[PDB]
């Protein structure tokens, strides 16, 4: 709530912007418009592109690579907006940059931003 | 008391602990059921709008459909598709106008039809559900046209084609009673019956005038196509009920939603969708409050519930929020949906007792229109 | 016991008495000095291997046996995607079912039948002692038992820590014993955020315990025919390698041209690449992916030949959804991927990386 | 601030929803997006259609006909939204009805709603109001 | 003292009393001047967006321009036109994508050109002003493309036609310096100079690597085209300045926006447009606040003002609101514009004293980008 | 002064000695009993009037003189719209300049020249007295002064309250003395919210002090020739009436086919309608506006002929922006409008409504 305070992850509510996997999310949590933590809402198209972050999981003490993916082809959901930037690097290090609409690869050439999912892809290096 | 996001955090942690894999993919919405509710956000006249598909039981958004300028949503009562008449422009709000009907699969939410309406024929008006309507067989969509003159457009959802415009007299709204027939409400205070074959002028019959010049019937009557019940409040809470279940209009006894006393102490209906009708309960719900005679579009904090047969009051709920629109699920033990344009929140109440059970917030910018399928 | 069975497989594995002319053992084509692949030159270079008759060439490149013990047995999962098995076309269910095939393949070790195999095993008093202790007296006298027992020994040997040691730099880095160079680390970052991840990682999400850089699925990535290998194998100009569709019992034309996603472990030392050994260099195999993404004319040119990659051998069922990612790998990302993939080399083959660099 | 109280016209601030001439306005006051009380903002198209209200002017105690006109062809301005409904009748009395997008007659067939102006066109009163 | 709505009511009342006639019509915006400021509202990735044209002196919205998905606005420094590159879809956020550039007359706000961009080539990203840029003579618009690879699109505004895509190295942003030249910032820590013709491989030259790999240069550097000054803060409020006025890059001495003790006490820049540069005053303005190191896109409540030459601090303003972006008018006695995405309000401050002078609220949904013309 | 001047104008106005055969006065064509229009049935019905020679027909409908004194002098305003003047084509600047024209028009009163007008004035001892007292001794012996004085007297007579009494029902309702009927009030509401008020109201906004239901502009509403009237006028089947462009000084091609917006006061009793009297019924006049708005087959047809309206006599400069309102008047609104227009009838002509 102090926006400028160090982000403090929790592993108890995926709809809240401090959920530990959302450490570098930008946009809207898909869980809030009919997707889930790791699936897209009906009607939208799942991008294959992603950007990543290493997010600390306060449940197990481990840091995980969260390779975000956008759900595309719908106007922005408008529900559960969040912007976190842990480890977020500027656009010239795109694999860690989150202002980019990472909708590439989405079916039907969908490129509009609807929300983002937060799947794990690895333990951090 | 665990919230949906909390339950989801635990499932995710459990999958992670157990090393359980899952493929990221596009979810399907749960099959349509009685407790699905749609909330349309005309977004105070914004050029693009949203519809929220909500599981009324869980109070959870289960999908969304994008729309253009003041689209008219319709929901097939059997749950088999949804559709809207919508309007887009080649440059956001300017340029070539396309009016079109889209039909959507109610589970994948994918459009299964996109049907162009020639000559941009839609009536652009703050959203009135009965300005665009499905015939009972779901095969035809009828939409109203105001300009150059009252007219009704016939769209074939089955052939996925626009058919033609029907000349009507000076009349408004569209209440289909049959594959080839609908009623409209006329300036002279009658209803008109418009029966259209496949060609030529429709056959248009008028009822008796059923209200005086200075009695004002709201833009949002409730119409249960399955009951053929047209429930039409006036500004004072007087309620016209017209039975259309026989093909012709039988006027039911008129009823007062507010007591002669209440109206004396300033009680008037007010809101957007001020009236709801539960077909199996034969029950009318009316958003009311104490207000000046010309604050008829303001939110109301109270709902009154009354017998369509007798007019007796059954309940009076303090909604606990500023409510603009109500509707009800058509199942047994219905929810009473209370949508607040101001809060952008659908408050989901028990229709019997009026307790607020749950609510779904962040429903766009100025959500105003609740629709439910009547699937029983 | 698990020990003695693997030790028997270790002997069979290097024994050329299991080939018709006694010239070839498993170790001949799956050379342990070369991450269990074939260093020998044939009529198509290293693309395909030469059998015991000294003339017959296969139509597919000899794959590593490293980590092959981590592949699930062949199955169709709930999403209708086939997974697992052995051989590039998944036509063997698992290592055991695969092991007797090279023995009887006239293109490879060429023993005429199971009985000729058993007779060789009887000739050797260590086998009589070794097989008999594990499988019982007279096992070598029954060609069916002997053959099956040899396949079991051979599959057990391939399951030992020696074939899958997990002692690559990548493994060491994932233990926190060491760190990636900056180029390696970028290579890893790209690998896991670009489309490679969609196929060359065990899991769709979460973390694998023994990652081998393959999801074990079948994908047609739209490779051309390797003309020189195809000429060498003698299958004909009109032959189509249908991939997974060639497995008996697969009939679905959507499987035509799909091959098993290979483990990228030791990929740096097991060139040439792809199911037909079509690309010599690791970098070329990565560049092939840009044909689906890049708008530059060069994306369509195989840098090893200067000519178009070629029409896919099977033009249907390409994995376009995964392949057409919308993003092209620049050379810095290609370099980074090479460096990352080199980290997947087992410790004992690190010395072989010098020459490839 | 009480949305249900009788509306109380003022003649001191045109950007406020209780400005006397806004007595049946629905949308946004054009004065807040670069128009003025009675002119459209640049880029928009002025409709020739209108709906009318008789609005009471506290200042002279006279009642004036306000023939609202829409400025069309832009997305809604989002600034100074207001909805008042003095004398507002339902859609089958469209001359007094204000949910209608009254964009007819606008150049270029512009029919999207941006904001409304509040010009006076007469004195006079209605039977209904 | 008297509000604009108050002054308008007074004048309307006087016209009524005096019987004054006037024709209802479409206003022109006032002539563009130094105190015009444009606020773009990316609307948190909404498919349609708005730009507000504001008289900064009066604190008055004088016009609006609609746009599509994450458009990139540009304003000709000489006030002759404004333009944006924008993206629409045939069914709101789905369907056939069209990218296009519109050019608008800055008084009537009518589009004077609408130029289709082939193959939907725009980079869809949270709005970075320097990802779409006008050349100094105003005849060319350049836009960045990321997919499939970094590239720059060249659009001829005078002939109203798209020209070509240029392939560039792995580099970002576009600071045009001449009719045929711009610079980009590259992943390797150099700038790339790109000089292009109508056809042929552009000539691409790299500067020396000018920051280490772990010093992060923000997405919103200030670039004064007329001064050729590129002011590029890093996450720590270290400020790279690059002088491109010679046509090649000269690296100026680095300055620190924050002191050692400030930094030791957690002060860092943060927001969206974090830095402004006033060309005539040669002055840098940086949004700072006390914050953890990865809260670099949150609002800030302070602006430090520092001499660009010496790095001397001239002021630290307590903005008194949550500010995400700043910019300055380029006239003498500039205004300091402080846009709050959360308040949707443009706060207009005296740049000298830091005092808040006036404010313009209700600027859309998530307004983030302020643009001024440097007309002087 | 103004009283005696008007009273002299009053004598001249009814005096047929200002016509060649002494058979015709202003009042013959602008009959006070008919809101100052021509009751006389001619070859083209009442569409055009017949002059003193008993043979010559005009090519335009005789308009009312009621309220013509409210029209400003001809001028081009700052938006470039011409406004005001007299005659359907504004070719006269004001009433004074208009008054002499019928006297000397061979198709109307047909006096040969101003001297012949002066001579007739000289025959009447009462005129010598009346003119001399207002303009000085010998005024009738000078034909120029005599004719200007006659025109001035006629214009003063037309500026009297008698021509513009503002005693219609509409006037009484606006004064709070009476209420409109529901139908009249609906008609007034339609008239001020539909395109009619873009042209038949004095002002763009605000309240007019002396509303005459015209903005005094010029518009081509795309009317067809009145064939029989055009026959009777003898101007020929070629002929094109260019309206405003025929005023000397107007060269602007945008003005061809545009005519002055008539005041709708007394409209209910001054049929036939339009500049050429083409429509006999007020209802037809209103229906004509639907040709631009309505998609219905019937909108194309003049209900007096049962045939299409006719191509515009002048198919350029139509006021399409105003006329293509996008809305069609249903029969209800047409009725309502007729009721409303009938309220613009002066008190003294209320009996003519039937
Ligand atoms: C050269 C003539 C070979 C000899 C001798 C052996 N193998 Fe082999 N192996 C060879 C090729 C050409 C292939 C691929 C053929 C195809 O149809 O795909 C293989 C494959 C295997 C595999 C499957 C590995 C995988 O799919 O990832 C295994 C497990 C295997 N080979 C083991 C094996 C054993 C145990 C051998 C001696 C009995 C043996 N091979 C001999 C080439 C040759
Ligand atoms: C599924 C759609 C895949 C994607 C995306 C990537 N790869 Fe792949 N890879 C795939 C298969 C099915 C195969 C075998 C293809 C065949 O028919 O032979 C491969 C092969 C490789 C190889 C060669 C390995 C070997 O011969 O032992 C390499 C080096 C490789 N793949 C790398 C790679 C990278 C770096 C990718 C992201 C750019 C990538 N692959 C994507 C399946 C798929
Ligand atoms: C029939 C033979 C007429 C006699 C005698 C008079 N007038 Fe007339 N008037 C007549 C017509 C056909 C017209 C319209 C001609 C045209 O070209 O537009 C007129 C017009 C006027 C007007 C202008 C009215 C207006 O534009 O609204 C005025 C002021 C007028 N007439 C006055 C007038 C006087 C004073 C007369 C006696 C000298 C007189 N008219 C004779 C038909 C006839
Ligand atoms: C400006 C574009 C106009 C609009 C909109 C309407 N009217 Fe009109 N009207 C106009 C002109 C220029 C004229 C004279 C046309 C000509 O060339 O002769 C008229 C005429 C009438 C009449 C006839 C009056 C008479 O002949 O004395 C009537 C009854 C009339 N107009 C009514 C009317 C109504 C009711 C309208 C809204 C439907 C309307 N007009 C629109 C100019 C314009
Ligand atoms: Ca190989
Ligand atoms: Ca007439
Ligand atoms: Na080859
Ligand atoms: Na098969
Ligand atoms: Na002329």
Asked if B178 and B185 count as a contact pair (C-beta separation under 8 A), the reply is no
For the question of residue D70 being annotated catalytic, the response is yes
Q: Any idea which residues of E carry the catalytic annotation?
A: 69
DSSP states of B257-277 as a string? SS-HHHHHTTEEE-SSS-EEE
Question: Could you give the count of Cα atoms lying within 13 Å of A7 in the half-sphere of its Cβ?
Answer: 29
**CA dist., res. A114 & res. E367, Å (int):** 18
Residue C79 neighbours by CB distance under 10 Å: 9
DSSP states of C305-339 as a string? TTEE----SS-SSB-HHHH--S-PPPHHHHHHHHH
Q: Which residue bears the tokens 């929140």?
A: B345
Q: How far is the CA of C311 from the centre of ligand 7 (A)?
A: 15
Going by C-alpha positions, the residue among C290, C301, C292 that lies closest to residue C319 is C292
Q: Are residues C59 and C10 in the same domain?
A: yes
- By most ligand atoms within 8 Å of CB, the mutation choice from C11, C24, C30 for ligand 1 is C30
Method: X-ray
Q: Are residues C348 and C209 in the same domain?
A: yes
The tokens for C81 are 């995607």
User: Which of F204, F209, F217, F321 is the best residue to mutate to test the E interface, defined by the most E CB atoms within 10 Å of its own CB?
Assistant: F204
Residues of C in Cβ contact (< 8 Å) with A51: 193
**CA dist., res. E284 & res. E351, Å (int):** 11
Q: Are residues C152 and C246 in the same domain?
A: no
Q: How far is the CA of F62 from the centre of ligand 3 (A)?
A: 6
Indicate contact of D with A: 3+ CB pairs under 8 A.
no
**Interface contact flag, D124 F322, Cβ < 8 Å:** no
Is C242 a known ligand-binding residue?
no
Q: What is the largest CA-CA distance in chain A?
A: 40
Ligand nearest C16 Cα, by number? 1
Q: Which residue bears the tokens 């042929």?
A: E200
Indicate contact of C with D: 3+ CB pairs under 8 A.
no
What residues does the ion ligand 7 have nearby, CB within 5 Å?
Answer: C 226, 228
Q: Any idea which residues of A carry the catalytic annotation?
A: 51, 70
- By most ligand atoms within 8 Å of CB, the mutation choice from F5, F16, F23, F26 for ligand 3 is F26
The tokens for E288 are 């700072």
If phi over 0 gives left and psi between -120 and 50 gives alpha, with beta otherwise, what is residue B333? left
**CA dist., res. A59 & res. A40, Å (int):** 25
Q: How far is the CA of C211 from the centre of ligand 2 (A)?
A: 16
Burial level of E265, CB count in 10 A (0-12/13-18/19+)?
A: exposed
DSSP states of B232-265 as a string? EEBTTSEEEEEE-TTSS-EEPPPEESS-HHHHHT
**CA dist., res. C256 & res. A100, Å (int):** 37
The enclosing H or E element of B64 equals: strand B60-67
- Inform me whether the C-beta atom of residue D13 falls under 8 Å from chain F C-beta atoms: no
**DSSP 8-state secondary structure symbol assigned to residue C352:** G
Asked if F250 and F82 count as a contact pair (C-beta separation under 8 A), the reply is yes
Q: Which atom of ligand 2 is nearest to the CA of C337?
A: 35
Asked if C295 and C304 count as a contact pair (C-beta separation under 8 A), the reply is no
Q: How far is B269 from chain F (nearest CA, A)?
A: 27
Q: Are residues C232 and C334 in the same domain?
A: yes
**CA dist., res. F83 & res. E367, Å (int):** 48
Task: Write out the binding residues of F for heme c.
Answer: 26, 29-30, 196, 199-200, 275
- By most ligand atoms within 8 Å of CB, the mutation choice from F218, F221, F328 for ligand 4 is F221
Going by C-alpha positions, the residue among E48, A114, E368 that lies closest to residue D112 is E48
**CA dist., res. B202 & res. B206, Å (int):** 13
Is C275 a known ligand-binding residue?
yes
Which CATH number is F50's domain given? 1.10.760.10
**CA dist., res. E189 & res. E186, Å (int):** 6
Q: Are residues C14 and C41 in the same domain?
A: yes
DSSP, collapsed to helix, strand or coil, labels residue B38 as strand
**Interface contact flag, B91 E90, Cβ < 8 Å:** no
Asked if C84 and C78 count as a contact pair (C-beta separation under 8 A), the reply is no
The tokens for B60 are 């959870």
Q: Are residues F155 and F22 in the same domain?
A: yes
Considering only CB atoms, F192 lies closest to which of D38, D52, D105, namely D52
The tokens for E128 are 């970075």
Asked if C243 and C275 count as a contact pair (C-beta separation under 8 A), the reply is yes
Q: Are residues C207 and C323 in the same domain?
A: yes
Among candidate residues F121, F144, F165, the one where a domain is terminated: F165
The range of the structural domain enclosing residue F261 comes to 166-354
**Interface contact flag, E24 F206, Cβ < 8 Å:** no
**CA dist., res. B99 & res. B120, Å (int):** 5
DSSP, collapsed to helix, strand or coil, labels residue E290 as strand
Q: Does F24 sit in the ligand 3 pocket, CB within 6 Å?
A: yes
The enclosing H or E element of E6 equals: helix E4-18
Give residue ranges with CB within 6 A of ligand 2: C 194-196, 198-200, 219, 221, 223, 259, 261-262, 267, 270, 273-275, 282, 285-286, 289, 319, 322-323, 337
**CA dist., res. F182 & res. B213, Å (int):** 10
**CA dist., res. B345 & res. B353, Å (int):** 20
| In chain A, domain spans | 1-125
Q: Which atom of ligand 2 is nearest to the CA of C272?
A: 26
Among candidate residues F140, F165, F190, the one where a domain is terminated: F165
Asked if B93 and D75 count as a contact pair (C-beta separation under 8 A), the reply is yes
- What residues form DSSP beta bridges with E369? E40
DSSP states of C45-100 as a string? BTSS-B-TTSS-B-SS-----TTGGGSPPSEE-TTS-EE--BSTT--BSSHHHHHH
If phi over 0 gives left and psi between -120 and 50 gives alpha, with beta otherwise, what is residue C166? left
Three-state helix/strand/coil letters over chain F: CHHHHHHHHHHHHCCHHHCCCCCCCHHHHCEHHHCCECCCCECCECCCCECCCCCCECCCCCCCCCCHHHCCCCEECCCCCEECCECCCCCECCHHHHHHHHHHCCCCCCCCCHHHHHHHHHHCHHHHHHHHHHHCCCHHHCHHHHHHHHHHHHHHHHCCCCCCCCCCHHHHHHCCCCCCCHHHHHHHHHHHHCHHHHCCCCCCCCCCCCCCCCCCEEEECCCCCCHHHHHHHCCCCCCCCCEHHHCCCCCCHHHCCEEECCCCCCHHHCCCECCCCCECCHHHHHHHHHHHCCCCHHHHECCCCCCECCCCCCCCCECHHHHCCCCCCCHHHHHHHHHHHHCCCCHHHHHHHC
**Interface contact flag, F294 B149, Cβ < 8 Å:** yes
| CA-CA-CA-CA torsion sign (C169, C174, C176, C177) | negative
Q: Count Cβ neighbours within 10 Å for each residue of E356-365 and write b for 16 or more, e otherwise.
A: beebbebbbb
* Cα–Cα separations (whole angstroms), residue A108 to B23, B49, C320: 20, 22, 12
Phi, psi of F9 (to 5 degrees): -60, -40
Among candidate residues F165, F194, F226, the one where a domain is terminated: F165
Q: Are residues C229 and C280 in the same domain?
A: yes
**CA dist., res. C148 & res. F110, Å (int):** 134
**CA dist., res. D47 & res. B68, Å (int):** 21
For residue D68, give the chain F residue with the closest CA.
F193
**CA dist., res. F272 & res. F47, Å (int):** 6
Q: Does F151 sit in the ligand 3 pocket, CB within 6 Å?
A: no
Number of domains in chain F: 2
- What residues form DSSP beta bridges with E346? E339, E360
Peptide bond before residue B339 is cis, with ω within 30 degrees of 0 = no
* Cα–Cα separations (whole angstroms), residue E94 to B66, B68, B114, C322, E171: 9, 12, 13, 21, 30
Q: Which atom of ligand 2 is nearest to the CA of C267?
A: 27
Å resolution of this model?
1.9
* Cα–Cα separations (whole angstroms), residue C347 to C35, C214, C336: 11, 20, 20
The enclosing H or E element of E357 equals: strand E356-360
**CA dist., res. F122 & res. F140, Å (int):** 6
Q: How far is A5 from chain B (nearest CA, A)?
A: 23
DSSP, collapsed to helix, strand or coil, labels residue E354 as coil
**CA dist., res. C320 & res. F92, Å (int):** 81
Q: Are residues C124 and C14 in the same domain?
A: yes
Q: In the CATH scheme, what is the code of domain D1-129? A: 2.60.30.10
Q: How far is E98 from chain B (nearest CA, A)?
A: 10
Is C29 a known ligand-binding residue?
yes
The enclosing H or E element of B112 equals: strand B111-117
Q: Which residue bears the tokens 């259209």?
A: B196
Q: Count Cβ neighbours within 10 Å for each residue of E41-66 and write b for 16 or more, e otherwise.
A: bbbbbbbbbbbbbbbbbebbbbbbbb
For residue C293, give the chain E residue with the closest CA.
E148
**CA dist., res. B208 & res. C343, Å (int):** 88
The enclosing H or E element of B8 equals: helix B4-18
Distant-in-sequence, close-in-space partners of A96: CB < 8 Å, separation ≥ 6: A24, A51, A52, A53, A87, A88, A89, C189
For residue C333, give the chain E residue with the closest CA.
E170
Q: Strands of B325-328's sheet, edge to edge? A: B325-328, B335-340, B345-350, B356-360
Peptide bond before residue F272 is cis, with ω within 30 degrees of 0 = yes
DSSP states of A16-30 as a string? STTBGGGTT-EEEBG
Q: Which residue bears the tokens 């015939």?
A: B135
Q: In the CATH scheme, what is the code of domain A1-125? A: 2.60.30.10
Q: Are residues F342 and F211 in the same domain?
A: yes
Asked if F284 and F242 count as a contact pair (C-beta separation under 8 A), the reply is no
The tokens for B209 are 């005038």
Pairing label, strands B72-75, B82-91: antiparallel
Q: Whose CA is nearest to atom 3 of ligand 3?
A: F29
- Go through the domains of chain B in sequence order and give each one's CATH number: 1-376 (2.130.10.10)
Considering only CB atoms, B172 lies closest to which of D76, D81, D91, namely D91
**CA dist., res. D90 & res. D25, Å (int):** 14
Distant-in-sequence, close-in-space partners of F98: CB < 8 Å, separation ≥ 6: F86, F87, F92, F155
Residue C164 neighbours by CB distance under 10 Å: 20
């Amino acid at each position: 709530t102090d926006p400028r305070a160090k982000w403090v992850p929790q592993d108890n509510d995926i709809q809240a912007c401090d959920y530990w996997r959302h450490c570098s999310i930008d946009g809207n949590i898909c869980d809030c418009s009919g997707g889930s933590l790791t699936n897209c809402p009906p009607g939208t198209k799942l991008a294959t592109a992603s950007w990543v972050a290493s997010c600390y999981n306060p449940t197990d003490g481990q840091s995980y690579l969260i390779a975000y993916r956008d759900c595309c082809g719908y106007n922005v959901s408008g529900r559960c907006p969040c912007l976190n930037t842990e480890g977020e690097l500027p656009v010239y290090r795109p694999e860690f940059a989150n202002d980019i609409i990472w909708c590439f690869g989405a079916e039907d050439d969908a490129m509009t931003y609807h929300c983002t999912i937060s799947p794990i892809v690895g333990k951090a290096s | 008391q665990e919230t949906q996001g909390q339950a989801a955090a635990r499932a995710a942690a459990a999958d992670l602990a157990a090393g359980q894999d899952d493929e990221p993919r596009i979810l399907e919405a749960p099959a349509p059921d009685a407790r699905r509710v749609y909330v349309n956000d005309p977004a105070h006249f914004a050029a693009v709008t949203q519809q929220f598909v909500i599981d009324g039981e869980a109070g959870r958004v289960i999908g969304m459909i994008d729309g253009g300028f003041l689209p008219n949503p319709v929901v097939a009562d059997d749950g088999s598709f949804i559709a809207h008449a919508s309007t887009v422009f080649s440059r956001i709000a300017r340029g070539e106008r396309t009016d079109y009907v889209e039909v959507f699969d109610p589970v994948t939410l994918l459009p299964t039809a996109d049907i162009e309406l020639p000559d941009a024929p839609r009536f652009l008006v703050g959203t009135y559900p009965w300005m665009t309507s499905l015939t009972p067989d779901g095969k035809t969509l009828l939409f109203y046209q105001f300009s150059p003159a009252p007219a009704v457009g016939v769209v074939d959802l089955e052939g996925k084609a626009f058919k033609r415009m029907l000349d009507v007299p000076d009349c408004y709204h569209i209440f289909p009673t049959a594959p080839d027939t609908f009623f409209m409400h006329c300036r002279d205070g009658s209803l008109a019956k418009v029966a259209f074959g496949t060609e030529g002028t429709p056959e248009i019959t008028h009822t008796e005038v059923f209200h005086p010049e200075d009695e004002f019937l709201i833009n949002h009557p409730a119409y249960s196509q399955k009951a053929g019940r047209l429930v039409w409040p006036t500004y004072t809470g007087k309620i016209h009920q017209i039975d259309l279940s026989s093909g012709d209009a039988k006027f039911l006894p008129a009823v007062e939603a507010l007591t002669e006393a209440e109206r004396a102490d300033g009680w008037r209906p007010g809101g957007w969708q001020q009236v709801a009708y539960h077909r199996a309960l034969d029950r009318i719900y009316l958003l009311v409050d104490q207000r000046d005679e010309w604050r008829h579009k303001t939110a109301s904090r109270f709902v009154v519930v009354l017998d369509a047969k007798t007019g007796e009051r059954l309940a009076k709920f303090e909604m606990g929020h500023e409510i603009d629109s109500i509707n009800v699920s058509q199942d047994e033990k219905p929810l009473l949906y209370a949508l607040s344009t101001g809060d952008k929140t659908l408050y989901i109440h028990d229709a019997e007792s009026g307790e607020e059970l749950r609510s779904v917030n962040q429903l766009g910018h100025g959500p105003q229109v609740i629709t439910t399928a009547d699937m029983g | 016991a698990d020990d003695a069975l693997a030790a028997l497989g270790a002997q069979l594995f290097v024994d050329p008495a299991l080939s018709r002319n006694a010239t070839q053992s498993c170790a001949t084509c799956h050379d342990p000095a070369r991450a269990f692949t074939d260093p020998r030159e044939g009529k198509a270079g290293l693309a395909v291997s030469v059998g015991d008759d000294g003339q017959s060439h296969g139509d597919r490149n000899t794959p590593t046996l490293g980590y092959a013990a981590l592949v699930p047995a062949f199955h169709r999962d709930a999403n209708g995607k086939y997974k697992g098995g052995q051989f590039w076309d998944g036509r063997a269910d698992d290592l055991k079912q695969q092991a007797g095939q090279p023995m009887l393949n006239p293109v490879e070790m060429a023993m005429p039948d199971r009985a000729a195999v058993a007779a060789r095993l009887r000739d050797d008093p260590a086998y009589r002692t070794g097989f008999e202790a594990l499988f019982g007296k007279g096992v070598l006298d029954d060609p069916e038992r002997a053959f099956d027992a040899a396949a079991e020994a051979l599959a057990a040997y391939q399951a030992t820590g020696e074939f899958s040691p997990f002692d690559s730099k990548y493994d060491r880095v994932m233990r926190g014993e060491e760190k990636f160079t900056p180029l390696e680390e970028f290579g890893y970052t790209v690998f896991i955020t670009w489309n490679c991840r969609l196929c060359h990682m065990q899991r769709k999400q979460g973390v694998a315990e023994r990652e081998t850089f393959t999801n074990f699925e079948y994908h047609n990535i739209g490779l051309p025919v390797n003309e020189t290998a195809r000429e060498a194998s003698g299958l004909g100009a009109d032959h189509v390698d249908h991939g997974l569709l060639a497995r008996p019992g697969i009939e679905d034309p959507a499987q035509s041209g799909r091959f098993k996603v290979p483990s990228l472990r030791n990929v740096a030392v097991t060139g040439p690449y792809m199911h037909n050994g079509v690309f010599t260099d690791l970098r070329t195999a990565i560049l092939f992916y840009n044909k689906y993404t890049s708008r530059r004319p060069e994306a369509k040119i195989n840098p090893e030949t200067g000519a178009p990659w070629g029409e896919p051998e099977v033009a249907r069922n390409l994995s376009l959804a995964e392949l057409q990612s919308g993003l092209m790998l620049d050379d810095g990302r290609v370099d980074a991927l090479v460096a990352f993939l080199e980290t997947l080399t087992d410790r004992r083959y690190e010395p072989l990386l010098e020459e490839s660099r």
